[PDB]
Each structure stands twice: as C-alpha cells, then as structure tokens.
Design a binder for this molecule. Structure first.
Ligand code: CHL
Ligand code: CLA
Ligand code: CLA
Ligand code: CLA
Ligand code: CLA
Ligand code: CLA
Ligand code: CLA
Ligand code: CLA
Ligand SMILES: CC1=C[C@H](O)CC(C)(C)[C@H]1/C=C/C(C)=C/C=C/C(C)=C/C=C/C=C(C)/C=C/C=C(C)/C=C/C1=C(C)C[C@H](O)CC1(C)C
Ligand SMILES: CC1=C[C@H](O)CC(C)(C)[C@H]1/C=C/C(C)=C/C=C/C(C)=C/C=C/C=C(C)/C=C/C=C(C)/C=C/C1=C(C)C[C@H](O)CC1(C)C
Ligand SMILES: CCCCCCCCCCCCC/C=C\[C@H](O)[C@H](N)CO
Lengths: 229, 213, 227
C-alpha cells in the first residue's frame, strides 16, 4: 500500500478507503468523522480551484507574455464595470456554493432542477456530483479519482509557489522557470537569502505596497514579508 | 514514578498527576482544596492562553520592527494606534469590557453550574456551550476541527503541550517586561545585542539587574 | 573473556561483548536504555565513518595540495576550477536536498528495521541489511562481508574512534598554530622544545568572523585564547 513514508504506521483514523489516502495526518485533523467528511469536500473544492487557477495562469502567460498574472486584476479593462462584475460573480458563486453546501449537509436534497421537473441528478456521493457534471468518464472511476486528488495537491502547491515567486521576483511561472534554468546555482531561494545569528537578509518585495486602481490605493502587500528567510 | 519539579521530593496528595502538566509543584499548598484547585486550573489555562497570544503578537511585531516595515514596539503600539487612527481610547476600553464581560460572565456561570449554558437561552445554541471538562470548553465553536472529540491519547498529549507552552509564554511575558524595564528596548533588539556579543551583553552587564556589579 | 579498558574494573551488565569494540566502557551509564543504546550505536557509527573520511581527506588534500589551508578551504575563493567563486547558496541547496533524502532513508531504517531496503523506483533492487547501520548490497559491491564480520566491524569501530580523536586533534592544532597537521608535525620535528602545546596554546589564529560574499559568518576557537 502506498504511503507518504515507506515503512511507517499510518494513523488509526486512516484505513485507505477514501481516494488519495496515503496515511498522512500528523496533527490528526481527520480523526473525527464529521470533520473528515467536511474536509474531504474542502480538499476537493481546493483541488479543482487550484487546478483551474494554475491552468489559467499558464495559458495567460503563454498567450499574453506582456501581462503579469499578479497584475491581471489591475491592467484589464472591460465595458462591464468592476462593481457590476463583482455583483454578477457574487450572485452566481453564492447560488452554486449554497447548492453545494446544502448537498453536503443534506445529501440527495438539491439534485433536482428547479426550472424543469424532468431533469434530476442521479444518486451519487458527496463531493462527486456526476450526471450532467460528468458527461465523459474515460477510464476507471477510482483510478481517475486518485489522479484527480493527486493533480489537485500538486496544483495547490503550484499555486502557492506561483504566488511566492511572483512576490519575491516579480516574474511569472514561465519567466521564473527560464531565469532559474539560465543560472540555477544563483537563482534559487538559497542564493537570494540566508539567515545567521549575526545577520538576517531577505529578498526585497517586488510588489508595490499600494496600487492606484481608479484613485483608491488598494494595498497589495507581500504575504508575511517579515517572516521571509 | 512520574517526574516532579524537585527530584527526590514526594509529590503532594492534591497533585496526583491527573491534570495536564502535573509535576507536583505546590510548596505553599495554594491548591489543596478541590474547588480551589479547579478554579486555579481554569485560571492557569486562561493565563497561559493569553500569554501565548501576547508572546506571539510581541514576537511578530518585533520581527516586523527589526526589518524595515515600520512596525512599532509592543510598548508603544497602543499610542501609535490611538494617535494614528481616530480611535477614542475610553470607547475602545468600554467595547472591550463589554465583549469580555459577556464571554467571561458566561464562562464564570458555567464554572459555577457545569452545562448550564447549554440550556439554549442564548440564541438557541445548546451543544456549542455544553463544555467538556474544567478549563477545556469543547464544541463546534471553540474547537471546529474536532480535535477534542477523537484520539484520546493525542488529546492528552495536546493538553500537555498546551499547559507547557502556556507556562513558557507566561515566563516569556515576564521576561519581556523585565527586559523593557532594564534595557529599554524591544525583545528582539536585546536578542540582537546578545547575539552580537554574548560574553559582554547580558543581564550581568546591563548595570540594572545586578546593582553590585 | 575480552579485555576491559581498565585493569580491575567490572564491565556493565548491559555490555557483554555482543557489539564490536566493546571494552566495557560506560562511566555515564548512557547505555542503560536499550533504545538509547541502539541510537547511540548508530550515532557512533556515523561519527566514526565521517571522521575517517574527514581525516583521510585532510591528509590527502595536504599531500596533493600543500598550499591550500584545510581550515580556510571552505571559502569560495579557495575552491578549485571550475567551482571557484561559485554561489554558495546553490551549493548548500544541493547538499541539503541530497543529504536530507539519504538521512531520511537512514532514519526510517533505524525506526522501522528492514522497511526501506527496496528501491522505490526500480522494484527488485534491495539490500540485504543484516544489522542496523550495516546495509551492504549496493553499499558493499566488493562483497567483503561474506566472512569474519566480527573482527572486521571491530577494526572499523576502532579505526573510527582513532580518526575521531585525530580529526579533533587536527582542529585544535589548526586553531592554536594555524597550519595543517603535516605542516605542524614538520614544525614540531624542527624544534620539539620550541613548538609544542606549552607555547602554542593561548593563541587563537581563527579570526572573529568571515565575510563569505554577502553575509558574515561568526567564527570562534574551542577555548578562550588570544584572537
Ligand atoms: C494587558 C497588559 C498591558 C500592559 C502591560 C500594558 C503596558 C503599557 N501600555 Mg497598554 N498595556 C496593557 C494593555 C492595554 N493597553 C491598552 C492601550 C494602551 C494605550 C492607548 C497606550 C498604552 C500604553 C502603555 C504603556 C504605558 C503604561 C500604561 O498605560 O500601562 C497600563 C497597563 C498596566 C499598568 C499593566 C496592566 C496589567 C498588566 C505600557 C508599556 C501607552 C503607550 O504605549 O505609550 C507609549 C499608550 O498610549 N496602552 C489597551 C487597550 C485599551 C490594553 C488592554 O486592553
Ligand atoms: C480560476 C479560474 C480562472 C480565473 C479566475 C481567470 C481569470 C482571468 N483570466 Mg483566465 N483562463 C482560465 C481560468 C481562469 N481565468 C483557464 C482554465 C484558461 C485556459 C483555457 C484560461 C485562459 C485565459 C486566457 C487566454 C486569458 C485569460 C484571461 C483572464 C483575465 C481576464 C479575462 C476575463 O475574466 O474576462 C472575461 C472572459 C470572457 C468573457 C470569455 C468567456 C468566458 C467563458 C465563456 C467562461 C467559461 C466558463 C468555465 C468553463 C467554467 C469553469 C468554472 C471553473 C473554472 C471554476 C482574468 C483575470 C485573459 C488575460 O490574460 O487578461 C489579459 C486572457 O488572455 N484566461
Ligand atoms: C509546487 C512545486 C514547486 C516548484 C516546481 C517550484 C519551482 C521553483 N521555485 Mg518555488 N515554491 C514552492 C513550490 C515550488 N517551486 C512553494 C510551495 C513555495 C512556498 C514555500 C515556494 C516558494 C518559492 C520562492 C520564494 C522562490 C521559489 C523559486 C523557484 C524557482 C527557483 C529554484 C527553486 O526551486 O527555489 C526554491 C523552491 C522552494 C524552496 C520550494 C520548493 C518546494 C516544492 C513544494 C517541491 C515540490 C516537489 C515536487 C516533487 C517537484 C515538483 C515537480 C516538478 C518536477 C514538475 C523554481 C523554478 C525562486 C524563484 O522565484 O525563482 C527565481 C524563489 O525565490 N519558490
Ligand atoms: C489594509 C490593511 C493592512 C495593511 C496595510 C497591512 C500591512 C502589513 N501587514 Mg497585515 N493584516 C491585516 C491588515 C493589513 N496589513 C489584517 C486585517 C490582518 C488580520 C487577518 C493582518 C494580519 C497580518 C499578519 C499575521 C501579518 C501581517 C503583516 C503585515 C506586513 C507585511 C505585509 C503583509 O501584509 O503580509 C500579508 C499578511 C496577510 C494576513 C495578508 C492579508 C492582509 C490583506 C491586506 C487583507 C486584509 C483585508 C482586511 C479584511 C481589511 C505589512 C506592513 C506581517 C508582519 O507583521 O510582518 C512581520 C504578518 O505576519 N498582517
Ligand atoms: C490577545 C493578544 C494580542 C493583543 C492584545 C494584540 C494587540 C495588538 N496587535 Mg496583535 N497579534 C497577536 C495578538 C495580540 N495582539 C497574535 C497572536 C498575532 C499573530 C502572531 C498578532 C499579530 C499582529 C500583527 C501583524 C499586528 C498586530 C497589531 C496589534 C495592535 C493593533 C490593534 C489591533 O489588534 O488591530 C486591529 C484589530 C483587528 C483587525 C481585529 C478585528 C476584530 C474583528 C472585526 C471582530 C469580528 C495591538 C496593540 C498591529 C500593529 O502592530 O499595530 C500597528 C499589527 O499589524 N498584531
Ligand atoms: C522565557 C525565557 C527567556 C529567554 C529565552 C530569555 C532570553 C534573554 N534574556 Mg531574559 N528574562 C526572562 C526570561 C527569558 N529571557 C525572565 C523570566 C526574566 C525576569 C527575571 C528575564 C529578565 C531579563 C533581563 C533583565 C535581561 C534579560 C536579557 C535576555 C537576553 C540575553 C542576556 C541574558 O541571557 O540575560 C539573562 C536572562 C535571565 C537570567 C533569565 C533566565 C530565567 C528564565 C526562566 C530561564 C530561561 C532559560 C530557558 C529555560 C532556556 C532556553 C529555552 C530554550 C531555547 C531551550 C536573552 C535573549 C538581557 C537583555 O535584555 O539583553 C540585552 C537582560 O538584561 N532577561
Ligand atoms: C567527506 C569528506 C571530505 C570532504 C567534506 C571534502 C571536501 C573537500 N575536498 Mg576532499 N577528499 C576526501 C574527502 C573529503 N573532501 C578524500 C577521502 C580524499 C582522498 C580521495 C579527498 C581528496 C581531495 C583532493 C585531491 C582535493 C579535495 C578537495 C576538496 C575541497 C573542494 C571540493 C571539491 O572537491 O570539489 C567538488 C566535488 C565534486 C565535484 C565531486 C573540499 C572542501 C580539493 C581541494 O583541495 O580544494 C582546494 C582537492 O584538490 N579532496
Ligand atoms: C590546569 C589549570 C589552568 C587554568 C585554569 C588556566 C587558565 C588560563 N590560562 Mg593556562 N596553562 C596551564 C593551565 C591552566 N591555565 C598549563 C599547565 C599551561 C602550560 C602548558 C598553561 C599555559 C598557558 C598559556 C601559554 C596561556 C595560558 C593562558 C590562560 C588564561 C586564558 C584562557 C585560555 O584560553 O588560555 C589557554 C588555555 C589553556 C592553556 C588550557 C588549559 C587546560 C589545562 C592544561 C588543563 C589541565 C586562563 C585564565 C593565556 C594567558 O596567559 O592569558 C593571557 C596564555 O597565553 N595558559
Ligand atoms: C506555581 C506557584 C504555586 C506555589 O505554591 C507558589 C509560587 C511559587 C508563587 C507559584 C508560582 C507562580 C508563578 C510563577 C506565577 C507567574 C505567573 C505569570 C508569570 C503570569 C503571567 C501572565 C502573562 C500574561 C497573561 C501576559 C499576557 C500578555 C498580553 C496579553 C500582551 C498583550 C500585548 C501585546 C500582544 C502587544 C501590544 O503592543 C501590547 C499588549 C496589549 C500589552
Ligand atoms: C564514550 C563516552 C560515553 C561515556 O559514558 C562518557 C564519555 C567519556 C564522555 C564518552 C566519550 C565521548 C567521546 C570521547 C566523544 C568524542 C567524539 C569525537 C572525538 C567526535 C569527533 C568526530 C569528528 C568528525 C565527525 C569529523 C568529521 C570531519 C569532517 C566532516 C571534515 C570535513 C572537511 C574536510 C575533509 C577538510 C576540508 O578542508 C573541509 C571540511 C569540510 C571541514
Ligand atoms: C430582518 C430581521 C432578521 C432578524 C434580525 C435579527 C433578529 C435576531 C433573532 C434571532 C433568533 C434567535 C433565536 C432563534 C431561534 C430559537 O432557537 C427558536 N425560536 C426557539 O424555539
């Protein structure tokens, strides 16, 4: 059985039933049944959101190399006003998240289409809607589920790395990859900073403290810059 | 059997090792009575939790102060916030006293009558204020991760870690106060001065701690 | 019976002679706990092997490169080509990643014996691993373990202890005089009554600090001598 540490004893609350179960829980946050049931949905939502975000950032830089992803919310002009876009996004996201949350607390209760009484989602698990949400399923269900959770974990760590690299160097993922491949011995985080008992040096935050978006001065600070190594 | 604060000395009868962080340290017998020990247990837990929050905040602010971030020291943050932001000090004090009064009063009356706050008289919430043990208020609001309702051994280990970290944070806050009153600078400034020269920059050379030096 | 470290002393009950190099020497009784004894045996094996490697490296470096000081050999300006003036950050990253991987594998082998012998990528490539701290297989390709392993392990631990003492002697000699062990030996042979620990002591040739490129690394001697 695959585990996060070969030859290690997995925790008692992890029996290898859920997809992606590799017996990794040092804090035991998944010991409770209700907490684990809620965290499973949270991890699935996080996985899909991070995968979509990483794909979006990569396509955004490849297609548009002159637009920084961190500045994507700043240098994009659209006829639809920012307040109108926020209202539309808030209403649609609120509706879908309410439906998902109700299915979490009460399974098989919001699977019915309100406008048309003939459409209804087939019985499924929690966090895996299926039906209209899964038109094509090429391969095994359990195998694809494991692939989904693994790709999601990698995408979550990838988005965190994207944010940190954009805050430390100010370059996108492709730009950072090329700069790192050019000088690998001097472009890693170890080369940029080091801490000793007599000195503590950290790389400067390339992101400006304030961003003037229609004269409002939106604060854009580097995530925990004081704790940077 | 278990380790004590003074090896070779027998532990007292009122300290049998049932509580977390029990080392049999009570030379003045202040907690010999059961109700008094219960009250002191809750007092020590609250003190340690507040000390932990204070030590974490002071360390983080001093970290931001050492680096070029403009963070004020912990002994001047109140003045900086009250003068920088148009905030009335007595109004903030009254709001803080109102919130703390409501929370601490519910906690006090729960200590007097365990499980009384779970009657549903506060907005209908019942299981969120039922309470687990003395000084350990379990529930979905205080413990949304559910760590107190699963893996008993891990829970006891976390209880020991919490009491030890609380005592360490209390000692840390006392050290912060003494360091500020003796050297005049922040804790990280004192740490940098000590790391720069540990043989000559310490409490034996500050000129305040040891008067005969 | 085996020979003890002191004539007339009685060896501890937990030191019967099973492990190699057991002279019945444990004045602090740190071997009373079996778990602690196994951990200390692994620690001693690591110390012995690393010390032997360090002593041999210092000696061969002083022979092949007599003009490069082994104490200051860690500076980037003293590295040979094509590694001169290289960024120490990437070097530290390389060492951290590789050493972290192998040390985690070794630690897992200590915690769970015989659980990480198999190669995680290419299945079927395992090591025999008879005892703890003795993996063998790919680590011993010449196959010298198919014989008297007791005397061989005894020689290994004794040579490692001698090398530990030797490397610490090298460190203190370089700290008091400022030269390699071979150079210090030649200097002592030139005048034994003039170059010894009676006069070279009290002087610490190691400076207060060093500025490796951008950051400053504090340095000190093992004793409060004259800087
Ligand atoms: C809980 C411990 C606590 C301690 C040790 C201090 C300590 C200090 N505060 Mg203070 N405060 C504390 C809580 C609080 N302060 C404030 C609001 C302020 C302001 C607005 C100011 C201070 C200031 C000060 C300093 C001047 C002395 C003083 O007023 O002492 C009062 C506290 C004690 C005598 C100790 C109480 C028991 C421990 C001092 C170093 C002044 C400052 O920083 O000047 C440069 C200042 O202007 N505090 C609030 C919010 C209302 C607090 C708690 O709710
Ligand atoms: C986390 C999801 C996510 C988010 C928040 C964004 C956000 C953004 N993208 Mg992006 N994108 C994404 C995913 C995402 N993208 C993916 C997965 C791809 C790969 C196909 C792309 C490829 C892409 C390109 C090529 C470009 C952007 C651009 C932009 C920026 C302006 C475009 C815009 O919103 O106007 C509105 C967009 C439209 C009106 C087009 C129609 C929108 C369709 C119909 C919606 C599709 C619905 C979708 C399938 C539902 C899945 C939901 C799920 C992701 C949660 C904006 C900040 C542009 C940019 O870089 O700015 C300069 C741009 O050039 N994106
Ligand atoms: C998701 C994996 C991932 C990957 C592939 C990278 C890759 C990279 N990072 Mg990054 N990083 C990551 C995660 C990752 N990071 C996370 C989670 C953080 C937050 C702690 C950071 C914080 C960070 C900073 C602050 C910086 C980089 C920088 C860099 C680049 C220079 C070399 C370096 O590795 O520095 C060091 C990287 C780390 C210390 C974190 C790496 C740890 C990840 C999780 C390892 C993943 C292991 C996985 C098996 C390998 C990925 C698969 C891959 C083969 C596709 C490089 C292209 C530097 C840069 O911007 O380039 C100029 C830079 O300064 N990273
Ligand atoms: C717009 C107000 C504002 C501004 C200008 C700052 C500015 C700063 N914060 Mg801070 N912070 C704020 C609000 C703000 N914060 C709030 C409301 C919280 C509570 C969640 C925090 C919690 C916080 C922590 C824990 C830390 C900082 C730290 C810092 C410094 C490093 C950069 C950073 O933000 O890391 C990013 C940290 C974040 C938590 C990002 C979220 C902050 C944004 C502005 C969202 C807040 C919006 C809010 C609802 C209004 C920096 C000068 C770090 C520091 O002190 O250095 C030693 C640090 O450790 N902040
Ligand atoms: C009970 C302990 C304690 C106390 C009394 C304080 C007190 C204070 N902190 Mg602090 N802090 C603490 C714990 C504590 N902190 C911990 C555990 C951390 C994480 C390590 C921090 C991290 C932190 C940061 C990063 C900052 C402060 C700052 C401040 C000062 C500004 C007031 C404020 O809180 O902003 C406002 C309060 C809020 C935003 C809370 C909103 C309450 C919501 C709306 C209720 C719903 C103030 C003197 C700031 C400062 O230094 O002043 C310049 C600052 O930026 N603290
Ligand atoms: C919470 C533990 C703690 C820690 C880590 C420190 C650390 C430090 N203190 Mg401090 N101190 C503490 C508690 C602590 N103190 C307490 C409770 C008091 C009130 C009596 C003081 C009163 C004090 C003064 C007056 C001064 C310092 C000073 C200093 C700095 C160096 C010089 C020195 O060692 O003075 C000696 C410190 C003591 C004699 C206090 C020791 C008593 C505690 C209980 C022992 C802590 C040791 C701890 C258990 C072992 C390390 C923990 C862990 C890493 C293993 C240094 C960074 C000096 C300074 O500001 O630098 C300029 C200074 O003059 N401290
Ligand atoms: C684990 C013990 C150890 C350590 C830490 C070192 C460390 C070092 N050795 Mg060394 N060496 C060792 C064992 C060791 N050696 C042994 C056992 C021998 C005998 C085979 C040698 C023979 C040796 C020679 C002949 C030289 C070094 C050199 C060096 C230095 C340059 C690094 C290098 O070789 O470039 C990178 C390493 C690789 C690319 C692989 C470096 C500080 C060089 C030097 O003197 O620097 C000035 C050099 O000329 N060593
Ligand atoms: C056995 C007790 C003893 C003690 C307590 C000391 C103490 C001291 N010696 Mg010293 N020394 C000793 C024996 C001792 N010595 C003997 C037997 C010799 C003859 C080899 C020397 C030769 C010597 C020299 C040449 C110097 C000192 C110096 C010093 C002072 C500086 C500390 C230092 O690191 O220097 C050196 C540390 C040692 C010599 C280690 C002594 C350990 C002994 C051998 C243990 C037995 C210090 C107060 C220095 C001084 O005079 O101050 C300016 C100095 O230059 N000593
Ligand atoms: C046991 C016993 C018994 C026997 O019999 C006898 C004897 C011996 C006597 C004993 C002992 C005792 C002791 C030791 C005690 C101590 C205590 C403490 C120290 C506490 C503290 C405690 C401490 C604490 C709480 C603290 C807390 C803190 C805090 C909140 C802080 C806050 C803050 C911050 C953040 C920052 C800002 O800027 C400011 C402020 C606002 C200020
Ligand atoms: C047994 C016991 C027990 C009882 O009970 C008590 C008592 C008595 C206490 C005891 C004893 C103890 C002891 C003696 C100890 C010691 C140890 C040692 C010496 C170590 C070293 C050890 C040592 C070691 C490791 C070493 C190592 C080395 C090295 C790495 C080096 C490296 C290098 C080189 C090559 C050179 C170059 O240029 C650089 C470098 C990089 C620098
Ligand atoms: C537009 C007004 C919306 C409500 C505004 C705030 C009113 C606050 C009332 C909260 C109700 C608290 C108690 C609620 C449910 C009780 O548990 C049950 N009625 C008891 O049977």
């Amino acid at each position: 059985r695959p585990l996060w540490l070969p030859g290690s004893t997995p925790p008692a609350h992890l029996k290898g039933d859920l997809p992606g179960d590799f017996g990794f829980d040092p804090l035991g946050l998944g010991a409770n049944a209700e907490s684990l049931k809620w965290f499973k949905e949270s991890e699935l939502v996080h996985s899909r959101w991070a995968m979509a975000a990483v794909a979006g950032i990569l396509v955004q830089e490849i297609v548009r190399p002159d637009v920084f992803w961190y500045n994507a919310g700043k240098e994009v002009e659209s006829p639809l006003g920012p307040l109108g876009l926020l209202a539309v996004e808030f209403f649609l996201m609120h509706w879908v998240e309410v439906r998902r949350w109700q299915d979490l607390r009460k399974p098989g209760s919001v699977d019915q289409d309100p406008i048309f009484s003939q459409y209804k989602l087939p019985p499924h698990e929690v966090g895996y809607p299926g039906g209209v949400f899964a038109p094509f399923i090429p391969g095994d269900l359990a195998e694809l589920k494991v692939k989904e959770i693994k790709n999601g974990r990698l995408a979550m760590l990838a988005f965190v790395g994207f944010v940190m690299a954009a805050q430390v160097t100010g370059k996108g993922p492709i730009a950072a990859l090329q700069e790192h491949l050019a000088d690998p011995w001097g472009t890693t985080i170890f080369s940029k900073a080091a801490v000793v008992p007599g000195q503590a040096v950290a790389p400067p935050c390339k992101i400006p403290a304030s961003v003037s978006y229609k004269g409002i001065e939106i604060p854009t600070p580097c995530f925990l810059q004081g704790l940077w190594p | 059997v278990r380790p004590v604060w003074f090896p070779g000395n027998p532990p007292p009868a009122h300290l049998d090792g049932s509580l977390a962080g029990d080392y049999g340290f009570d030379p003045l017998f202040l907690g010999q009575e059961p109700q008094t020990l219960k009250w002191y247990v809750q007092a020590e837990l609250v003190h340690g939790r507040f000390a932990m929050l204070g030590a974490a905040g002071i360390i983080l602010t001093s970290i931001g102060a050492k680096v070029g971030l403009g963070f004020p020291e912990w002994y001047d943050a109140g003045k900086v916030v009250v003068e920088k932001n148009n905030i009335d000090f007595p109004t903030l004090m009254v709001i803080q006293f109102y919130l703390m009064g409501w929370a601490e009063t519910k906690r006090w009356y729960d200590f007097k009558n365990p499980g009384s706050q779970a009657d549903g008289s506060f907005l209908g919430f019942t299981e969120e204020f039922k309470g687990l043990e003395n000084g350990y208020p379990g529930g979905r609001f205080f413990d949304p991760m559910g760590l107190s309702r699963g893996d008993a051994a891990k829970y006891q280990e976390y209880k020991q870690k919490e009491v030890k970290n609380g005592r360490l944070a209390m000692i840390a806050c006392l050290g912060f106060a003494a360091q500020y009153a003796a050297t005049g600078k922040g804790p990280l400034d004192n740490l940098a001065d000590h790391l720069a020269d540990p043989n000559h920059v310490n409490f034996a050379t500050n000129g305040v701690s040891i008067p005969i030096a | 019976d085996r020979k003890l470290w002191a004539p007339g002393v009685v060896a501890p009950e937990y030191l019967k002679g099973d492990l190699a190099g057991d002279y019945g020497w444990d004045p602090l009784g740190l071997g009373a706990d079996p778990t602690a004894l196994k951990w200390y045996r692994q620690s001693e094996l690591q110390h012995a092997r690393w010390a032997m490697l360090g002593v041999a490296g210092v000696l061969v470096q002083e022979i092949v490169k007599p003009d490069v000081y082994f104490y200051e050999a860690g500076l980037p300006q003293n590295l040979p080509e094509p590694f001169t003036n290289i960024n120490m950050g990437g070097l530290l990253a390389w060492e951290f990643i590789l050493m972290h991987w192998v040390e985690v594998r070794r630690w897992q082998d200590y915690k769970n014996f015989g659980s990480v012998n198999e190669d995680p990528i290419f299945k079927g490539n395992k090591v025999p691993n008879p005892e703890m701290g003795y993996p063998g297989g790919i680590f011993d390709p010449f196959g010298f373990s198919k014989g008297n392993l007791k005397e061989l392990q005894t020689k290994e631990i004794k040579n490692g202890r001698l090398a530990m003492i030797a490397y610490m002697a090298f460190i203190l000699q370089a700290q008091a005089t400022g030269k390699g062990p071979l150079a210090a030996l030649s200097a002592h042979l030139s005048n034994p009554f003039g170059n010894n620990i009676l006069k070279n002591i009290g002087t610490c040739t190691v400076p207060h600090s060093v500025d490796v490129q951008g950051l400053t690394i504090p340095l000190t001697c093992l004793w409060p001598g004259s800087q």
